[PDB]
Amino acid sequence: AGVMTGAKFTQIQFGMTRQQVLDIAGAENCETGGSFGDSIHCRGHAAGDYYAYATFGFTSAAADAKVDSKSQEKLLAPSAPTLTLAKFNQVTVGMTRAQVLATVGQGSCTTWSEYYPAYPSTAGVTLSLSCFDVDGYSSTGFYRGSAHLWFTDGVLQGKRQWDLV
Ligand SMILES: [N+]
């Protein structure tokens, strides 16, 4: 029932088939083809330009293919955002995911994108986090203070911010 939600996103697991994903998300919410290729894109509540949404990628277009990629915008909210420019600057290329979260706060970041290129293997796993200052997150409009953090194999590779002080 209903649109795509953070709860349904959380319930979907790497390794699930397309049938299982569509059963959980609600097939009326979702589309494939065009620019998405074989990925499945599912819409949540309206949100300015567009909608919150999730995009799921699969090992192949086959019926038994497995979820190897999960991405979302505006479905999960950061729980306690405290990011500052100071914290952003003390994060460094080469830190582990655990040292980064300790630096920026457990509750400042949500998972933007998570992809296993050799699923079920964890080699080459790429993770992107989107992290916010105190009013930087919007579930409806433009963001107001955020960073993106890119990890490969568990280690920070890159960082970028917009509007942090
Ligand atoms: N892609």
Coordinates of N, CA and C and ligand atoms in Angstrom, one line a residue:
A1 N 0.9 -1.2 0.0 CA 0.0 0.0 0.0 C 0.9 1.2 0.0
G2 N 0.4 2.3 -0.6 CA 1.0 3.6 -0.4 C 2.2 3.7 -1.4
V3 N 2.8 4.9 -1.2 CA 4.0 5.3 -2.0 C 5.3 4.6 -1.5
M4 N 6.4 4.9 -2.1 CA 7.7 4.4 -1.6 C 8.0 5.2 -0.3
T5 N 8.4 4.5 0.8 CA 8.8 5.2 2.0 C 10.1 4.8 2.5
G6 N 10.7 5.5 3.5 CA 12.0 5.0 4.2 C 11.9 3.6 4.7
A7 N 10.8 3.3 5.4 CA 10.6 1.9 5.9 C 10.7 0.8 4.8
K8 N 10.0 1.0 3.7 CA 10.1 0.0 2.6 C 11.5 0.0 2.0
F9 N 12.2 1.1 2.0 CA 13.6 1.1 1.5 C 14.5 0.3 2.4
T10 N 14.2 0.3 3.7 CA 15.0 -0.3 4.7 C 14.8 -1.9 4.6
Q11 N 13.6 -2.2 4.3 CA 13.1 -3.6 4.2 C 13.7 -4.3 3.0
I12 N 14.0 -3.6 2.0 CA 14.6 -4.2 0.8 C 16.1 -4.4 1.0
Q13 N 16.5 -5.6 0.6 CA 17.8 -6.2 1.0 C 18.6 -6.3 -0.3
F14 N 19.9 -6.1 -0.3 CA 20.8 -6.6 -1.3 C 20.6 -8.1 -1.5
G15 N 20.7 -8.5 -2.7 CA 20.4 -9.9 -3.0 C 18.9 -10.3 -3.3
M16 N 18.0 -9.4 -3.1 CA 16.5 -9.7 -3.5 C 16.3 -9.6 -5.0
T17 N 15.3 -10.3 -5.5 CA 15.0 -10.3 -6.9 C 14.1 -9.1 -7.3
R18 N 13.9 -8.7 -8.5 CA 12.9 -7.7 -8.9 C 11.5 -8.0 -8.4
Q19 N 11.0 -9.3 -8.5 CA 9.7 -9.6 -7.9 C 9.6 -9.1 -6.5
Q20 N 10.6 -9.5 -5.7 CA 10.6 -9.2 -4.3 C 10.6 -7.7 -4.0
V21 N 11.4 -6.9 -4.7 CA 11.5 -5.5 -4.6 C 10.2 -4.8 -5.0
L22 N 9.5 -5.3 -6.1 CA 8.3 -4.7 -6.6 C 7.1 -5.0 -5.6
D23 N 7.1 -6.2 -5.1 CA 6.2 -6.6 -4.0 C 6.2 -5.7 -2.8
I24 N 7.4 -5.3 -2.3 CA 7.6 -4.5 -1.1 C 7.3 -3.0 -1.4
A25 N 7.8 -2.5 -2.6 CA 7.7 -1.1 -2.8 C 6.4 -0.7 -3.3
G26 N 5.6 -1.7 -4.0 CA 4.4 -1.4 -4.6 C 4.6 -1.0 -6.1
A27 N 4.2 -1.9 -7.0 CA 4.6 -1.8 -8.4 C 4.1 -0.5 -9.0
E28 N 3.0 0.0 -8.6 CA 2.5 1.3 -9.2 C 3.4 2.5 -8.9
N29 N 4.4 2.3 -8.0 CA 5.2 3.5 -7.7 C 6.5 3.5 -8.6
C30 N 6.7 2.5 -9.4 CA 8.0 2.2 -9.9 C 8.0 2.1 -11.4
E31 N 9.2 2.3 -12.0 CA 9.3 2.3 -13.5 C 10.7 1.8 -13.8
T32 N 10.9 1.3 -15.1 CA 12.2 1.0 -15.5 C 12.3 1.5 -17.0
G33 N 13.4 1.2 -17.7 CA 13.6 1.6 -19.1 C 14.0 3.1 -19.2
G34 N 14.0 3.6 -20.4 CA 14.5 5.0 -20.7 C 15.9 5.2 -20.0
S35 N 16.1 6.3 -19.5 CA 17.4 6.6 -18.8 C 17.7 5.7 -17.7
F36 N 16.8 4.9 -17.1 CA 17.2 4.1 -16.0 C 17.8 2.8 -16.5
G37 N 17.8 2.5 -17.8 CA 18.2 1.2 -18.2 C 17.4 0.1 -17.6
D38 N 18.1 -0.9 -16.9 CA 17.4 -2.0 -16.3 C 17.2 -1.7 -14.8
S39 N 17.5 -0.6 -14.3 CA 17.4 -0.3 -12.9 C 15.9 0.1 -12.6
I40 N 15.5 -0.1 -11.4 CA 14.1 0.2 -11.1 C 14.1 1.5 -10.2
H41 N 13.2 2.4 -10.6 CA 13.2 3.7 -9.9 C 11.8 3.8 -9.3
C42 N 11.7 4.1 -8.0 CA 10.4 4.1 -7.3 C 10.2 5.4 -6.6
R43 N 9.0 6.0 -6.8 CA 8.7 7.3 -6.2 C 8.0 7.3 -4.8
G44 N 8.4 8.2 -4.0 CA 7.8 8.5 -2.6 C 6.9 9.7 -2.7
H45 N 6.8 10.5 -1.7 CA 6.0 11.7 -1.6 C 6.5 12.8 -2.6
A46 N 5.6 13.7 -3.0 CA 6.0 14.8 -3.9 C 7.1 15.7 -3.0
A47 N 7.9 16.4 -3.7 CA 9.1 17.1 -3.2 C 9.6 18.1 -4.2
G48 N 9.0 19.3 -4.2 CA 9.4 20.4 -5.1 C 9.4 20.0 -6.6
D49 N 10.6 20.1 -7.1 CA 10.8 19.6 -8.5 C 10.1 18.3 -8.9
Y50 N 10.2 17.3 -8.0 CA 10.0 15.9 -8.3 C 9.4 15.2 -7.1
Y51 N 10.0 14.2 -6.6 CA 9.5 13.3 -5.5 C 10.7 12.8 -4.8
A52 N 10.5 12.4 -3.5 CA 11.5 11.5 -2.9 C 11.5 10.3 -3.8
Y53 N 12.5 9.4 -3.7 CA 12.6 8.3 -4.6 C 13.7 7.3 -4.2
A54 N 13.7 6.2 -4.8 CA 14.7 5.2 -4.6 C 15.0 4.7 -6.0
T55 N 16.2 4.3 -6.2 CA 16.6 3.6 -7.4 C 17.3 2.3 -7.0
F56 N 16.9 1.2 -7.5 CA 17.6 -0.1 -7.2 C 18.2 -0.6 -8.5
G57 N 19.5 -1.1 -8.4 CA 20.2 -1.6 -9.6 C 20.3 -3.1 -9.4
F58 N 20.4 -3.9 -10.5 CA 20.5 -5.4 -10.3 C 21.6 -6.0 -11.1
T59 N 22.1 -7.1 -10.7 CA 23.3 -7.8 -11.3 C 23.1 -7.9 -12.8
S60 N 21.9 -8.0 -13.3 CA 21.6 -8.2 -14.7 C 20.1 -8.0 -14.9
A61 N 19.7 -8.1 -16.2 CA 18.3 -7.9 -16.5 C 17.5 -9.3 -16.3
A62 N 18.2 -10.3 -15.9 CA 17.5 -11.6 -15.8 C 16.5 -11.7 -14.7
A63 N 15.5 -12.6 -14.8 CA 14.4 -12.7 -13.7 C 15.0 -13.0 -12.3
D64 N 16.0 -13.9 -12.3 CA 16.7 -14.2 -11.0 C 17.8 -13.2 -10.6
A65 N 18.0 -12.1 -11.3 CA 19.1 -11.1 -10.9 C 18.9 -10.6 -9.5
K66 N 20.0 -10.1 -8.9 CA 20.0 -9.7 -7.5 C 20.2 -8.2 -7.4
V67 N 19.6 -7.6 -6.4 CA 19.9 -6.2 -6.0 C 21.3 -6.0 -5.7
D68 N 22.0 -5.2 -6.4 CA 23.4 -4.9 -6.1 C 23.6 -3.5 -5.8
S69 N 22.6 -2.6 -5.9 CA 22.8 -1.2 -5.7 C 21.6 -0.6 -5.1
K70 N 21.7 0.3 -4.1 CA 20.5 1.0 -3.5 C 20.9 2.4 -3.4
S71 N 20.0 3.3 -3.9 CA 20.2 4.8 -3.8 C 18.9 5.4 -3.4
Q72 N 18.9 6.5 -2.7 CA 17.7 7.2 -2.3 C 17.9 8.7 -2.1
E73 N 16.9 9.5 -2.4 CA 16.9 10.8 -1.9 C 15.5 11.2 -1.3
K74 N 15.6 11.7 0.0 CA 14.5 12.3 0.7 C 13.6 11.2 1.3
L75 N 14.1 10.0 1.3 CA 13.3 9.0 2.0 C 13.7 8.8 3.4
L76 N 15.0 8.9 3.7 CA 15.5 8.9 5.1 C 16.1 10.2 5.5
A77 N 15.8 10.7 6.7 CA 16.1 12.0 7.2 C 17.3 11.9 8.1
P78 N 18.3 12.8 8.1 CA 19.3 12.6 9.1 C 18.6 12.8 10.5
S79 N 19.0 12.0 11.5 CA 18.4 11.9 12.8 C 18.7 13.1 13.7
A80 N 20.0 13.6 13.6 CA 20.5 14.7 14.5 C 21.6 15.5 13.7
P81 N 21.3 16.3 12.8 CA 22.4 16.9 12.0 C 23.2 18.0 12.7
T82 N 24.5 17.7 12.9 CA 25.4 18.7 13.5 C 26.7 19.0 12.7
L83 N 26.7 18.7 11.4 CA 27.9 19.0 10.6 C 28.2 20.5 10.6
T84 N 29.5 20.8 10.7 CA 30.0 22.2 10.5 C 31.0 22.2 9.4
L85 N 31.5 23.4 9.0 CA 32.6 23.4 8.1 C 33.9 22.9 8.8
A86 N 34.0 23.1 10.1 CA 35.2 22.7 10.9 C 35.3 21.2 10.9
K87 N 34.2 20.5 11.2 CA 34.2 19.0 11.1 C 34.5 18.5 9.7
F88 N 33.9 19.1 8.7 CA 34.2 18.7 7.3 C 35.6 18.8 7.0
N89 N 36.3 19.8 7.5 CA 37.7 20.0 7.2 C 38.6 19.1 8.0
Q90 N 38.1 18.6 9.2 CA 38.9 17.6 9.9 C 38.8 16.1 9.4
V91 N 37.8 15.9 8.5 CA 37.7 14.6 7.7 C 38.8 14.6 6.6
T92 N 39.5 13.4 6.5 CA 40.6 13.3 5.5 C 40.5 12.1 4.6
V93 N 40.9 12.2 3.4 CA 41.1 11.2 2.5 C 41.9 10.1 3.1
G94 N 41.4 8.9 3.1 CA 42.1 7.8 3.8 C 41.6 7.4 5.1
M95 N 40.7 8.1 5.7 CA 40.0 7.6 6.9 C 39.0 6.5 6.6
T96 N 38.8 5.7 7.6 CA 37.8 4.6 7.5 C 36.4 5.2 7.8
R97 N 35.3 4.5 7.5 CA 34.0 5.0 7.7 C 33.7 5.3 9.1
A98 N 34.3 4.5 10.0 CA 34.1 4.6 11.4 C 34.8 5.9 12.0
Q99 N 36.0 6.2 11.6 CA 36.6 7.5 12.0 C 35.9 8.7 11.4
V100 N 35.3 8.6 10.2 CA 34.6 9.7 9.6 C 33.3 10.1 10.4
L101 N 32.6 9.0 10.8 CA 31.3 9.2 11.5 C 31.5 9.8 12.9
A102 N 32.6 9.3 13.6 CA 33.0 9.8 14.8 C 33.3 11.3 14.7
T103 N 33.9 11.7 13.6 CA 34.3 13.1 13.4 C 33.0 14.0 13.1
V104 N 32.1 13.6 12.3 CA 31.0 14.4 11.8 C 29.7 14.1 12.6
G105 N 29.7 13.1 13.4 CA 28.5 12.8 14.2 C 27.6 11.7 13.5
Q106 N 27.2 10.8 14.4 CA 26.5 9.6 14.0 C 25.2 9.9 13.3
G107 N 24.6 11.1 13.7 CA 23.3 11.4 13.2 C 23.2 12.5 12.2
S108 N 24.3 12.8 11.5 CA 24.4 13.9 10.5 C 24.2 13.4 9.1
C109 N 24.4 12.1 8.8 CA 24.5 11.5 7.5 C 23.5 10.4 7.3
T110 N 23.0 10.4 6.0 CA 22.2 9.3 5.5 C 23.0 8.6 4.4
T111 N 22.6 7.4 4.0 CA 23.2 6.7 2.8 C 22.5 7.2 1.6
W112 N 23.3 7.7 0.7 CA 22.8 8.2 -0.5 C 22.8 7.0 -1.5
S113 N 24.0 6.4 -1.7 CA 24.1 5.3 -2.7 C 25.0 4.2 -2.1
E114 N 24.7 3.0 -2.4 CA 25.6 1.8 -2.0 C 25.5 0.7 -3.0
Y115 N 26.7 0.3 -3.5 CA 26.8 -0.4 -4.8 C 27.8 -1.5 -4.5
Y116 N 27.5 -2.8 -4.8 CA 28.5 -3.9 -4.8 C 28.7 -4.3 -6.2
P117 N 29.9 -4.0 -6.8 CA 30.1 -4.3 -8.2 C 30.3 -5.8 -8.4
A118 N 30.7 -6.6 -7.4 CA 30.9 -8.0 -7.6 C 30.0 -8.8 -6.6
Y119 N 28.8 -8.2 -6.3 CA 27.9 -8.8 -5.5 C 27.8 -10.3 -5.8
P120 N 27.7 -11.2 -4.7 CA 27.7 -11.0 -3.3 C 29.1 -10.6 -2.6
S121 N 30.1 -10.6 -3.4 CA 31.4 -10.2 -2.9 C 31.3 -8.8 -2.5
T122 N 32.1 -8.4 -1.4 CA 32.2 -7.1 -0.9 C 33.4 -6.3 -1.5
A123 N 34.1 -6.9 -2.4 CA 35.3 -6.2 -3.0 C 34.8 -5.1 -3.9
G124 N 35.4 -3.9 -3.7 CA 35.0 -2.8 -4.6 C 33.8 -2.0 -4.2
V125 N 33.2 -2.3 -3.0 CA 32.0 -1.7 -2.5 C 32.2 -0.2 -2.5
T126 N 31.2 0.5 -3.1 CA 31.3 2.0 -3.1 C 30.1 2.5 -2.3
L127 N 30.4 3.4 -1.4 CA 29.4 4.0 -0.5 C 29.5 5.5 -0.6
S128 N 28.3 6.2 -0.9 CA 28.2 7.7 -0.7 C 27.3 8.1 0.4
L129 N 27.8 9.1 1.2 CA 26.9 9.6 2.3 C 26.6 11.0 2.0
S130 N 25.4 11.4 2.4 CA 25.1 12.8 2.2 C 24.8 13.3 3.6
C131 N 25.5 14.3 4.1 CA 25.5 14.8 5.4 C 25.1 16.2 5.5
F132 N 24.4 16.6 6.6 CA 23.8 17.9 6.6 C 24.1 18.7 7.9
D133 N 24.2 20.0 7.8 CA 24.1 20.9 9.0 C 22.7 21.0 9.5
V134 N 22.5 21.8 10.6 CA 21.3 21.7 11.4 C 20.0 22.0 10.7
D135 N 20.0 22.9 9.7 CA 18.8 23.1 8.9 C 19.1 22.7 7.4
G136 N 20.2 22.0 7.1 CA 20.5 21.7 5.7 C 19.6 20.7 5.0
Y137 N 18.9 19.9 5.8 CA 18.1 18.9 5.2 C 16.7 19.4 4.9
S138 N 16.2 19.1 3.7 CA 14.8 19.3 3.3 C 14.3 18.0 2.7
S139 N 13.1 17.5 3.3 CA 12.3 16.5 2.7 C 11.4 16.9 1.6
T140 N 11.4 18.3 1.3 CA 10.6 18.9 0.3 C 11.3 19.8 -0.8
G141 N 12.2 20.6 -0.3 CA 12.9 21.5 -1.2 C 14.4 21.4 -1.4
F142 N 15.1 22.4 -2.0 CA 16.5 22.6 -2.0 C 17.2 22.4 -0.7
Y143 N 18.4 21.9 -0.7 CA 19.2 21.7 0.6 C 19.8 23.0 1.0
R144 N 20.3 23.1 2.3 CA 20.7 24.4 2.8 C 22.1 24.3 3.5
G145 N 22.9 23.4 3.2 CA 24.1 23.1 3.9 C 24.4 21.6 4.0
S146 N 25.2 21.1 3.1 CA 25.4 19.7 3.0 C 26.8 19.3 2.5
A147 N 27.2 18.1 2.8 CA 28.4 17.4 2.1 C 28.0 16.1 1.5
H148 N 28.8 15.7 0.5 CA 28.8 14.3 0.1 C 30.2 13.7 0.4
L149 N 30.2 12.5 0.9 CA 31.4 11.7 1.2 C 31.3 10.4 0.5
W150 N 32.4 10.1 -0.3 CA 32.6 8.9 -1.1 C 33.6 8.0 -0.6
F151 N 33.3 6.7 -0.3 CA 34.2 5.7 0.2 C 34.2 4.6 -0.8
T152 N 35.4 4.0 -1.0 CA 35.5 2.7 -1.7 C 36.2 1.8 -0.8
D153 N 35.8 0.5 -0.8 CA 36.4 -0.5 0.1 C 36.5 0.1 1.6
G154 N 35.5 0.9 2.0 CA 35.5 1.3 3.4 C 36.3 2.5 3.8
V155 N 37.0 3.1 2.9 CA 38.0 4.2 3.1 C 37.6 5.4 2.3
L156 N 37.6 6.6 3.0 CA 37.2 7.8 2.3 C 38.1 8.2 1.2
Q157 N 37.5 8.4 0.0 CA 38.2 8.8 -1.2 C 38.0 10.2 -1.6
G158 N 36.8 10.8 -1.2 CA 36.6 12.1 -1.7 C 35.5 12.8 -0.9
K159 N 35.5 14.1 -0.9 CA 34.6 14.9 -0.1 C 34.3 16.2 -0.8
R160 N 33.0 16.7 -0.7 CA 32.7 17.9 -1.3 C 31.5 18.5 -0.4
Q161 N 31.6 19.8 -0.2 CA 30.5 20.5 0.5 C 30.0 21.7 -0.3
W162 N 28.8 22.1 0.1 CA 28.1 23.3 -0.4 C 27.5 24.0 0.8
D163 N 27.8 25.3 1.0 CA 27.2 26.2 2.0 C 27.5 25.9 3.5
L164 N 28.5 25.2 3.8 CA 28.8 24.9 5.2 C 29.6 26.1 5.8
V165 N 29.3 26.5 7.1 CA 30.1 27.5 7.7 C 30.6 26.9 9.0
Ligands
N1 N 24.1 3.8 -14.5

